[PDB]
Homo-oligomer: 188 residues x 4
């Protein structure tokens, strides 16, 4: 008689926090602007972790939540088991006692057949800005799709309604990401 179209949002997904052993529904983050970052410990970009802490500190009052997703698909730069990831950040790289000031989740794929379902959603929702997907070397997964994540520390912004709004290359500095987010927050 009547068809009601049911629409997809970020709140349809969930993941296991690294530091508890407990599932976190993204419904927790209703009304918040969510920054999803795929992370790794042994990347040149790992140096930006304290910049991510600073971003989160600065913009928490504006309703920004940063979420970090370890992934070993990009140069095999997250080799650690889940229990090893936080100790590696604290004592190896960045080292110096570093602890993320935002929520990290269990390690998993962001591309290919076993990719996490939230990343399918994010990737299908927002195109990557570059025509470059990779080098012969960098692509390690199967199948390969035009909206795949290119590398460690790629980023997605999800609005306060759970619909993805924006995506940055891993090549964009955290400072430029902040500047972009600050200009986006002026709407609200």
């Amino acid at each position: 008689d009547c068809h009601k179209d049911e629409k997809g949002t970020i709140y349809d997904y969930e993941a296991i926090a690294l530091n508890k052993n407990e599932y976190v529904s993204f419904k927790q983050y209703v009304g918040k602007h969510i920054l999803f970052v795929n992370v790794a410990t042994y990347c040149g970009l790992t140096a930006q972790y304290p910049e991510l802490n600073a971003l989160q500190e600065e913009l928490k009052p504006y309703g920004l939540v940063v979420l970090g997703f370890p992934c070993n698909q990009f140069g095999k730069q997250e080799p650690g088991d889940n229990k090893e990831i936080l100790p590696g950040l604290k004592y190896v790289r960045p080292g110096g006692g570093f602890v993320p000031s935002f929520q990290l989740f269990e390690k998993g794929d962001v591309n290919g057949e076993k990719e996490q379902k939230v990343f399918s959603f994010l990737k299908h929702s927002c195109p990557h800005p570059s025509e470059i997907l990779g080098t012969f070397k960098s692509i390690s997964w199967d199948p390969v799709k035009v909206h795949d994540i290119r590398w460690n520390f790629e980023k997605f912004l999800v609005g306060p309604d759970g619909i993805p709004v924006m995506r940055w290359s891993h090549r964009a500095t955290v400072s430029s990401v902040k500047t972009d987010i600050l200009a986006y927050l002026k709407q609200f």
Copy 2:
């Protein structure tokens, strides 16, 4: 004082015919609808060669020109030197005396760093219809870009003004390509 914007077309490029040893400017094909196909001898799709002959026969009077570009990047399915390609089609696959009834050019890359410049133009001018770029296996070139050719026997249509109009997956039968071209030709 004044800037005149100079615009790119298919007529800006050229290639060496396989059967002469002579360069052919695509200016030759002014006012014609051009079907570019990347070809190979040892692909399952090689079976469609007689369908391409038939397409060309059927639509020559309507101003269609088919152009075939051997390429060894997709499963290494065009291993032959330029002199070996036509004998291979005639005597191996399809065999049976098969001769293409359209112009083939010298073998070269259609993707990656040494890709032919006409294929850069075509690929940048018309998106591929699928989000799937490949398998881990199928991608053999560097760098990898979202508008790369996926496989043997992918196809592009260029209008009578030299601007690319349409692109088909290698998965589309020559019959469906014909049907699509016949519907496009109704405008003229």
Copy 3:
């Protein structure tokens, strides 16, 4: 009470001829010196086919039998289905009407998990002379073993008792192989 040790020879194996559709037991070749060559159509070494014909002609009276085994594992240089291999040699490479004057068999693996059992025997029976197994590029099979065949047109000699005697690199000219075989035949 008593154990009798049963010993392995070339006569324990068989393969399907390319040009019949019939199995050939290597027992046929009892009392003969057998030269096994893995072959391909689109290799630089394919040029040596007429040298193999000449070798076979010259040494048939001395009891030499040459056997050719198409294989697609080395640069994917034997892409043809079994029915396409002889036409490819005649009309493509070497071309010119070339027909092998020795027996070719159906195409199959010589290395890795699906290798032909006769090649396991040969490889395990006679070491390769070089410490070099390959480049990162050349090795295409799994698993990888120290006595694997390195490339197209590697060669093994089996004595008149079915025990392998000698193995040549693909880098050895057919002339040097002949010279070596002629010196070996002086024992008999």
Copy 4:
């Protein structure tokens, strides 16, 4: 008039210690039995580090010196810069405060074109016991040679005269290595 043949030993080589920033000639180890191990932090075998400490403790009085060589060629399981390797062992894996009780050196290749010269010597001096070199996956270097190291935690014993004596697969437990070394030490 006269040629004197000059012979190669372990004392012809040197490497940079991880924990100093200083070169160590293997001449230091004259008259000692040297156990060379290629090591990594993120391997299943990394668990054997305390077994290596125990081996070294136990057999130091018998003149055994263990030497550890970080290498990132086997599953990319040593991603850390030189400064990160000891902190990773102490705080990540094995973790728990683990410090090696034997000398580790700077990270480098043990196979392929940029392999360390001491490993060329060792590998050329003592064959590996298995015919298996790898999987398609495990081999990451170029060129590939039959005496290459197969994986993390492969081992070589060098006698008190600097000539290599023995080599173990990475598949051999440290307990069996100890048992073998104890039986070898009975000669002296």
